[PDB]
Design a protein around this ligand. Structure first.
Ligand SMILES: Cc1cc2nc3c(=O)[nH]c(=O)nc-3n(C[C@H](O)[C@H](O)[C@H](O)COP(=O)(O)OP(=O)(O)OC[C@H]3O[C@@H](n4cnc5c(N)ncnc54)[C@H](O)[C@@H]3O)c2cc1C
Ligand SMILES: Cc1cc2nc3c(=O)[nH]c(=O)nc-3n(C[C@H](O)[C@H](O)[C@H](O)COP(=O)(O)OP(=O)(O)OC[C@H]3O[C@@H](n4cnc5c(N)ncnc54)[C@H](O)[C@@H]3O)c2cc1C
Ligand SMILES: NCCCC(=O)N[C@@H]1[C@H](O)[C@@H](OC(N)=O)[C@@H](CO)O[C@H]1/N=C1\N[C@@H]2[C@H](O)CNC(=O)[C@H]2N1
Lengths: 472, 466, 482, 482
């Protein structure tokens, strides 16, 4: 066929579905799948990310994606009316710097954000904390510096999904509400997709955007098991709160990224609601429910660091979702060794933000183009990337471990932190050396592996050895 | 007609249907059970565990405690009679036989130390089987050492039920006895909220925290039936990290403003943790952030650190019917009422059901319930001075239970500066009536308009009864 | 006589003694006071040459506060030549008076936003208005400090030419300079000032002796007003001075290091503050608590030692935790009841006062000494110091409303500075319940006078008999001046 | 006469001096040591007559621990007549040695369950086994205490006839009793013990003098082994004694009150503990920190003062917060490297040792003094003190595994005693990551000797050079005895 099947009905699948449907009105595009958010670019900057070449490449793509959002939103709202609600919930972001965290993360990351803004010539301003709208922190948890980032905003993800579905149907797209079980290929070319109702759908192009299940789906094809990097579940907890007085901030309020890619932010919503997020934990098997620990940490941070009024506010919903966490720390975007087989996944914290750029990239590739410059390193069929030295990762994992203390925030005898830093180094060095002679997992995954069962560690040692064998 | 489909309404519905097979009994209320206390309950069959020094210092408190001890004796046969109408696959109502009461220092000495001694004394006086045990012998618990118990009390035959399985068993038993479930609400004494009129010779109001507002519309009854407010309670269902649970109820004594910490075992790798309490002058159907954090923080530190890594399945919110004079509304009027049971209507349900059915049959029911007749002047079970001591102690207890860390001069400074404003409030509200601490704190922090409305209410009650 | 007796051997007494002795070589100047220096503020001081570092929003919101600040800036200009003139009378082995040239002010979140944020902005504004050399610097560029990350500063301010002196070396240099100028040290205390026919006759000492004098300069720190108040009518004409009891410590650092600059916060709850003053020889000074007491106290409380040490180890350097405690020091800041110093002449011919300087008499000492010596010589001394004449009705530098807002903020600041951890509703509840009792106290004390916050908190928690005695005092002052 | 020199003027030196002088009309007895009592344990002590209060599960799990406990119980019986005999040489104005008859042991949650819960049960068991008079009492019945509710005890144990002495009044009474019995106080320090032909000749003092003697008794606290170790072969034959640096304080209470009994916890992390010992005249003693140091230290650290004050104000009486700090005291508990005292004779004729008593030499003093004096007179002294002879191979009272479990528990206890507030996963993570480094250190130090936990933590955090010197020491001891 010249038929296109999109596997996955999140922001990535629907965004690629909309772009394909709008760009090839002559072809049938079918999308599979059943029934905050920050547009994070500069707010996502860390010293550690920008210290690596792969990190600077990923950041450049986030900055490119940000430029597409205003026209993208206009093109999606154009297919609806006033009563559909607004996709955009804020235009600007304030980054707050407080002392409820590690200096080695929060101080370094604040300086890195300021530098990245200046280098990109982005509009921004360091502002007086007193000039920050709405916030009412605990004085012992208050910010002493604040950074206004202009044109870095937030969307209502529910209104975005509704606008994407409406836009998909308007462009002639077909929704088939079943899951893909299997991609069929032979003679190095896609034939189509078997669905979980036993049916077969033919296609000339299959775009896999099935979140954390994307690699498991492609890895079943010959040789691909050790050629497509594994994706794990980055379980994230957020909450919808009805504010005591129905108020909200005019901007996103956030810290820089914190221990193990968690962070604190408040995204405005319409109708007296605020979104608060967000925890992150890489889990070696999926989990569908928030832990007690995750809910307490999120609520405690927001009530102390953002607004004490949230303490008396009504909890409407605890939300849980899986960030696709790629084992080498970078997304899987583009073509494979199988003609017509494409992947858009492993986007972790910022697949939603990158969605309009990733959609256009894959559509360009499908049309014989080269899409967006600088995505080549993030091709889905690859040896695991080694974006950092083992030494860099070992420094990072110990700093992030210590940051879980300072972010609590703990109160300990003053000799205890130095004692724990000293005694953490050995076990993480030993683990890294045992896992592989060539591959080192990023800190977020290394902590999950450190505290997993021996059987799960041994399975990863085997995985890493099978990848080495395949690519060397 | 029984108005209300909580434990009290269904329990009285079952007893009426089983006892008068010749009469049509219809029970009103919807599956949503808005603000429903019963589905938010663990629930503990709390008798001795509910004892406080403050309660047992009043005659009315000792009367309420005696009724709880009597109710406990009915539970085994009551459960047998409810499970008899079902099969194995309906699940078990009883979730535990025994209770361990823990004493730790994450609270006020003036509540927790006094209440532990009062529980021990009440057990000995009632000749109840119990034992002070080594904390090391308490199974399953894994507290933070800085939050750990140093004393523990095993109470034999004081257990817990699954409130959801209890409600299902009561409904099934009600239908088996020929009862009719009509899933609408009463608007007026019965006119229902679909505009219909249902005729009846008897109306039993067991509508939880809405019960007094429903009866108060009838001539003169606005100042003759004591007000009932919403004691908003937050609890949670947690799937434990390893699917384990304790063999017993684990609890503290009742704490600041009738909150408390407990874990009730459930089947299938779940535990119930509770429970916050806040008297609200208007109903609230959602947990606050503060309530969720306090509940989770207490359970993870004082009971089991493993709960920290456990999955949150459900945050539950219900309204304890909070009577303005601190005692239930049970019996006949100048029409019957079963309400204002606050923390222990579920536990007392089989006794209260049999009491009201006896009254309806021309009997005198259970001897000591006369003071708790629903049509009454507000009870004054304590002196103003006793309540002012209590409200300041409970206010300070919200600090010690957090637990806070403060400069050592601050607690005495706050005790001194709390006394005046509470004395001023009590004197302003009425020359004769004093609200119990739980309600006094809610009034202290309410709008001036809400305070003035209560001053008028108290004055209208005085005028009616004096 | 034309004899001069200086009563008191702190920085103010010795500084005025040196200036008198140097300026009137023809007269006998005798300085009273003992080596023990009981309740002595000066030996307990670091000490900071605090001008811009002492700026608060509250001080600079009052006319009297802006006047006192201008005098501190003027005093700073005298220090280099003053130190040169004092070291000149000694040799290399006497050691150096100056211990630092510059000050870093740190801003952290271990305190009330309503004090620390307001005061940091006020310091920056005062520096800009005075065209003083200064720079907001990256916290990472602050040398030596090693704070707890949860207690770390996020802003820092380098103040150039605002430094520190060793108060012990200063006192030794002043005594030596006093003797070099022909002064006589008599190590006894004054018990009584003798006056008749509106003129000083001299001083009875606590060994029973009588010393004659044409001039008596009272610089007896917190005892100064109690000494003069015995003279006819002066009990209600010289504002009361109380004890601002201050705790500091000398610490031998783990590695013998110290910072190159003063390290400090802005002034905090009830005029306490956190600072580290460099010393020679592997020692640092840490200070300093403040508590107004209605009676003198010569020993640190447990609370004061814990708070000082806890703040320094978390906010400045965790290495201080393992450092050796050499000395806990206690002195009395002379705390004037109306919040301003007592400097100049009286209705008694030849009777002068130099006191009530609270936190900054050591810094102002060379200016105050020259002012009083000018007055004694028939001059007008320094222009803005006439308002701080010792014989006066109590100053009312703030409205009752301003003081009531201040006392509640400072009370709440004692929580945030601890720092406490409380349920989030508790602070608002305590703010609400503090307002009434402080308003009631202020209204009860007097219809016209309001004590500043530092003294109002001491009175709030004093005995009923002490409150009633102050009500009588305020009524007697009103009667005398109205 | 046949001269005896006692080296050291603590409780052990003076107690042996008194017994010799009273018992031996044939000997001239001279006692060395200065009034300053540098590093002196005795003057820093409260002191508790600790027998049952000193019981821990860990001590009573070893044979050597049960032997030491039996001796403490025996020592208690001697105190009433000993005190009578010392006060007899003075008058009313000298003050009373005994300050309390009874002890209350409190159990709170400001500590590790693995120490405080185990130790409370061990104390109860030891009391019952000895048939000692005692009673578990309601906490509400404990007089005087006013703890923070979050730091309060939930169990309390009254121990009858286990009391306290004023260590200062004891030292004064011992000196006076020594002089009355014809003893000579020579206020200089020994620099060197002179011996030849396997016999003591006497002592070179730090004023350059030589004092001849037939007997030298070394009771120089933590300096005792370093003084004897210079003699041929004795460096590896007398177990090392380190400084168990202890911080205590004298506090004048806010109202001049005090408790009628000793108030204490069981022994806590690394042999620290919390106690209040009554004193006369509106004073209380609070103690006491412990830290084994490889070199002597004569000053409290900031950390030690904060921890001691914080524990006492929260766990015993909040009124201490507002009380006046009169004195911070520092002394060295003689900490033997093998965990047991050094009491009796040596391979050198006339050379005796009384040291390494750590926490309870003052309590054991009358028994230890009589033991050594009996030995000097050709007697056999007290049964069961032979195992603690000073010239010995290091004792191994516990398995390496027992000590490794103990050191990790004690390390974790430093967190719970603070008390810290941490994420709930952190303690298990720290327990896991502490095991490896302590196992590695223990294996590296020696194939045969394991230092007890108190010393192992000090070695773990010492310089590499200090660790290597101890590896050599242990190897030289092995070579000498095997
Ligand atoms: C903890 C602390 C920290 C400080 N830090 C600083 C700082 O950083 N910078 C700064 O500028 N200043 C500082 N100060 C000091 C402050 O400036 C004081 O206002 C100043 O030292 C007051 O000096 P004085 O000479 O008036 O009083 P004192 O220094 O108290 O001297 C008065 C002397 O007179 C003696 N005396 C009392 N009665 C009699 C009598 N009857 N007869 C004779 N003699 C008598 C007293 O014993 C005493 O020695 C600090 C003070 C304290 C307590
Ligand atoms: C903080 C603290 C609290 C304590 N609490 C208690 C308690 O409650 N109960 C209890 O029983 N015990 C207590 N102790 C003391 C403990 O029992 C000690 O083991 C005991 O005091 C040791 O006495 P000593 O005479 O061996 O040593 P020390 O008391 O140290 O006496 C040795 C003396 O010899 C001197 N000396 C050193 N070198 C020389 C030399 N070369 N020549 C001459 N003299 C020299 C020293 O200066 C010193 O004065 C406590 C100790 C401390 C530090
Ligand atoms: N704020 C970051 C969230 C992720 C995180 O901190 N993970 C931790 C770490 O891997 C490690 O702890 C620290 N503090 O470094 C580890 C210690 O065992 O615990 C992880 N967190 C948990 N992982 C545990 C399991 O999911 C089940 N039980 C729990 O309690 C869960 N908690």
């Amino acid at each position: 066929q010249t038929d296109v099947i999109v596997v996955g009905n999140g922001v990535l699948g629907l965004s690629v579905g909309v772009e394909i449907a709008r760009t090839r009105p002559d072809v049938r595009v079918t999308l599979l799948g059943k029934p905050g958010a920050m547009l994070g670019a500069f707010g996502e900057v860390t010293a550690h990310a920008l210290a690596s070449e792969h990190g600077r490449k990923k950041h450049a793509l986030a900055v490119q994606a940000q430029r597409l959002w205003p026209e993208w939103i206009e093109s999606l709202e154009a297919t609806g009316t006033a009563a559909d609600g607004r996709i955009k919930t804020a235009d600007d972001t304030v980054v707050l710097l407080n002392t409820v965290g590690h200096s080695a993360l929060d101080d370094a990351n604040f300086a890195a954000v300021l530098t990245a803004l200046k280098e990109a010539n982005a509009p921004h301003e360091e502002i007086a904390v007193e000039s920050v709208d709405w916030i009412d922190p605990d004085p012992n948890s208050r910010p002493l510096r604040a950074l206004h980032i202009e044109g870095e905003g937030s969307v209502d993800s529910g209104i975005l999904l509704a606008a994407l579905e409406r836009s998909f149907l308007q462009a002639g797209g077909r929704l088939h509400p079943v899951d893909a079980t299997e991609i069929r290929a032979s003679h190095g070319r896609v034939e189509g997709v078997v669905t979980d109702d036993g049916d077969f759908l033919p296609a000339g192009h299959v775009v896999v955007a099935a979140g954390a299940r994307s690699q498991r789906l492609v890895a079943a094809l010959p040789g691909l098991a050790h050629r497509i990097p594994r994706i794990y579940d980055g379980v994230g907890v957020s909450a919808l709160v009805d504010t005591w007085d129905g108020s909200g901030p005019a901007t996103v309020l956030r810290t820089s990224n914190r221990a193990f890619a968690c962070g604190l932010h408040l995204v405005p919503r319409a109708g007296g609601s605020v979104y608060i997020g967000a925890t992150n934990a890489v889990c070696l098997e999926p989990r569908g429910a928030a832990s007690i620990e995750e809910t307490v940490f999120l609520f405690n941070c927001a009530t102390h660091q953002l607004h004490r009024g949230l303490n008396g506010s009504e909890l409407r919903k605890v939300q849980v979702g899986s960030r696709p966490a790629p084992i080498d720390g970078f997304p899987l975007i583009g073509g494979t060794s199988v003609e017509g087989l494409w992947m858009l996944s492993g986007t972790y914290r910022d697949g939603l933000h990158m969605s309009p750029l990733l959609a256009r990239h894959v559509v360009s590739l499908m049309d014989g183009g080269t899409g967006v410059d600088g995505l080549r390193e993030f091709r889905p069929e690859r040896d695991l990337i080694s974006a950092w030295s083992r030494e860099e990762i070992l420094d990072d994992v110990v700093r992030h471990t210590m940051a879980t203390g300072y972010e609590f925030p703990w109160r300990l005898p003053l000799e205890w932190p130095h004692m724990m830093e000293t005694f953490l180094q050995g076990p993480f060095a030993e683990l890294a050396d045992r896992l592989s002679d060539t591959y080192t997992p990023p800190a977020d995954l290394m902590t999950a592996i450190m505290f997993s069962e021996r059987e799960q560690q041994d399975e990863l040692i085997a995985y890493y050895a099978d990848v080495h064998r395949e690519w060397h």
